[PDB]
Every structure is written in structure tokens, then in C-alpha cells.
């Protein structure tokens, strides 16, 4: 159908799916469980938490009106990781590799 429809479909069927399949996706597949991970300060520091499963559900639920809103959530997920953690941390390296894949898939976003 319309370009906007193809774009949101692309984000769900290709971008989200390929990120999930990537070996470094596992920390981003669920919301941070602060009790489990022993991180009382996580939701003190991160006020706009985001994860791939939340994105998945929103795409399934037709929550986003346009592709840009979904891309915002992906970017928020990466930004959260960069903000909370420190340079050189393994989690940051992982996020950077995942983000690179994200950018590559974005570069092929249909416009017609
Ligand atoms: C949230 C910040 C950042 C981030 O930005 N995102 C997005 C993120 C997302 N997801 C994860 N995943 C996990 C990270 C870690 C674990 C783990 O087992 N951690 C264990 C560390 C040792 C703890 N000890 C404490 C005292 N011990 C002693 C016993 C005798 C009392 C026994 C148990 C138990 C918990 C599991 C994960 O998933 C299952 N990490 C993330 N990070 C990491 C840098 C923490
Ligand atoms: Cl794994």
C-alpha cells in the first residue's frame, strides 16, 4: 500500500526482526528488571525506558501513526544504553554493533 504503510511494515517485518536475530539483541529483548539485575538506580536515571519487545508490541498493536515515531523509540533504546553505562563497557559495544545494523537497515527505508 502507501509509502507510510510500507515503512511501518518494513520496521516490523525486517528491521525489528533482523535486530532481534542479531546475537547482541538479548539484553534489549525485555524491559530492564531492576530487582533481578540488582540496579535500584536504573529507573531513577532512565525516565524513558525502551526495549525491543515494547517496540514489537506497539507495531503489532498499530500504536505508531508513522514510521518516525517508531524510529524514535529505537533511538531512545540506544541513547538510554549510552547514557546509563560507561565508555568501554561491554553493553555499550554491543549496543553500538546493534545500532550499526539498525542504521544499515534504515538506509534502505523505502520512500516511494
Ligand atoms: C541495565 C543496564 C545495562 C543496560 O543498559 N541494559 C539495556 C541492559 C539490559 N539487559 C541486561 N541483562 C542482564 C545483565 C546482568 C544480568 C545478571 O545476571 N546480573 C547479575 C550480576 C551479579 C548479581 N549478584 C549479586 C550478589 N551475589 C551474591 C549472592 C550471595 C548473595 C549474587 C547475584 C546478580 C545479577 C542479567 C541480565 O539479563 C538476564 N543488562 C543490561 N545492562 C547491563 C550493563 C547490566
Ligand atoms: Cl544469548
Quick synopsis:
This protein is an all-alpha fold and about 110 residues long. Helices cover about 65% and strands about 0% of the residues. Helix 1 (about 5-20) runs antiparallel to helix 4 (about 50-60).
Keywords:
112 residues, mainly alpha, 63% helix, binds the ligand CC[C@@H]1C(=O)N(C)c2cnc(Nc3ccc(C(=O)N[C@H]4CC[C@H](N5CCN(CC6CC6)CC5)CC4)cc3OC)nc2N1C(C)C
- Gyration radius over CA: 14 Å
Helix content: 55-70%
| Ends distance | 10 Å
Number of strands: 0
Domain Bromo: 5-109
Site (Histone H4K5ac binding): 85, 90
Family: Belongs to the BET family.
Subcellular location: Nucleus
Task: Present the secondary structure layout.
Blueprint: H1 3-21, H2 34-37, H3 42-45, H4 52-60, H5 67-84, H6 90-106
Bound molecules: the ligand CC[C@@H]1C(=O)N(C)c2cnc(Nc3ccc(C(=O)N[C@H]4CC[C@H](N5CCN(CC6CC6)CC5)CC4)cc3OC)nc2N1C(C)C and chloride ion.
Residues 27-28, 32, 37-39, 42, 81, 84-85, 91 line the site of the ligand CC[C@@H]1C(=O)N(C)c2cnc(Nc3ccc(C(=O)N[C@H]4CC[C@H](N5CCN(CC6CC6)CC5)CC4)cc3OC)nc2N1C(C)C.
Amino acid at each position: 500500500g502507501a509509502a507510510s504503510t510500507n515503512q511501518l511494515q518494513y520496521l516490523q517485518k525486517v528491521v525489528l526482526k533482523d535486530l532481534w536475530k542479531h546475537s547482541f539483541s538479548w539484553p534489549f529483548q525485555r524491559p530492564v528488571d531492576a530487582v533481578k539485575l540488582q540496579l535500584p538506580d536504573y529507573y531513577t536515571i532512565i525516565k524513558n525506558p525502551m526495549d525491543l519487545n515494547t517496540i514489537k508490541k506497539r507495531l503489532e498493536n498499530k500504536y505508531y501513526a508513522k514510521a518516525s515515531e517508531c524510529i524514535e523509540d529505537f533511538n531512545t533504546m540506544f541513547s538510554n544504553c549510552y547514557l546509563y553505562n560507561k565508555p568501554g563497557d561491554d553493553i555499550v559495544l554491543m549496543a553500538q554493533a546493534l545500532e550499526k545494523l539498525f542504521m544499515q537497515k534504515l538506509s534502505q527505508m523505502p520512500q516511494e
